[PDB]
Write a protein that binds this ligand. Structure first.
Ligand SMILES: Nc1nc2c(ncn2[C@@H]2O[C@H](COP(=O)(O)OP(=O)(O)O)[C@@H](O)[C@H]2O)c(=O)[nH]1
Ligand SMILES: Nc1nc2c(ncn2[C@@H]2O[C@H](COP(=O)(O)OP(=O)(O)O)[C@@H](O)[C@H]2O)c(=O)[nH]1
Ligand SMILES: [Mg+2]
Ligand SMILES: [Mg+2]
Lengths: 134, 134
């Protein structure tokens, strides 16, 4: 059993895709362990979440996008949940994300890509503690 | 603009219909304003939520059901949200709920009926204050 951190991004809200995204994960039989709705996440939180990208040219624009609307943070639990949810999510790059994946079916941009999911056990622990410090 | 309180009930988690239900409200263009996941709601909030029914024969069994699994409490905002979401919800009695409604399509029991929605302006204020004391 593993736990992974998922963010539903502001573009899901703008486009009314929140349920569509959550439903894909729900249909694969992952269970919600914690969940938090943010009318607007604090920029500091976003900066921490993306600390590993701080030197990338897109860092600030991505932070702006991530505070541009609401977010839902969710901790999902299930056997190999981290890798499995990453496969459902689909690749970041719109030239690569596979039809059948969340990004492959629904996302058309490298930034506005609807959903974050932890990429490893090490980052899951980190991200979960950022969004759910308790 | 109005705000209404919705509970996603434990039978929705059991039957994996959480997204399906939230999705119907999202497609109607209502906006999440607050949201909290409860792994198990405290008995006292449930009894206060249903205080109107405290002397009814079904009170204890209903309360028991409502703590039998997780729930999500959500505040939705929109023009005439209270009456419109109630219309989406459908009649408590499965002999009466209309196809096209949440309960008409999905519920088959007077108690395990998937969703709560505030029935009036006054009850919405009260229920919001219970679940989001803030
Ligand atoms: N390569 C790239 N990444 C971007 C850009 N703009 C924003 N990002 C964001 O940086 C976030 C974190 O990147 P990464 O860990 O590689 O992607 P993810 O795990 O698939 O979300 C991604 O979700 C992108 O939204 C861009 O212009 N180029
Ligand atoms: N067994 C039983 N349970 C009931 C009955 N009426 C209401 N309940 C339960 O009490 C909850 C609140 O009832 P009510 O406000 O009338 O219905 P609602 O607004 O449609 O949820 C319902 O969701 C049912 O679980 C009934 O006639 N029999
Ligand atoms: Mg990443
Ligand atoms: Mg009622």
């Amino acid at each position: 059993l593993q736990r992974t951190l998922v963010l539903i991004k502001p573009d899901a809200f703008e486009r009314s895709l929140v349920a569509e995204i959550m439903g894909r994960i729900e249909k694969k039989n992952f269970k919600i362990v914690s969940m938090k709705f943010w009318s607007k996440a604090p920029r500091n939180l976003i900066e921490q979440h993306y600390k590993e990208h701080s030197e990338q040219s897109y860092f600030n624009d991505n932070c702006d996008f991530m505070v541009s609307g609401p977010i839902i943070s969710i901790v999902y639990e299930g056997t190999d949940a981290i890798s499995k949810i990453r496969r459902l999510q689909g690749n970041t790059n719109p030239l690569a994300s596979a039809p059948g994946t969340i990004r492959g079916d629904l996302a058309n941009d490298i930034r506005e890509n609807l959903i974050h999911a932890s990429d490893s056990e090490d980052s899951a622990v980190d991200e979960i503690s950022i969004w759910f410090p308790e």
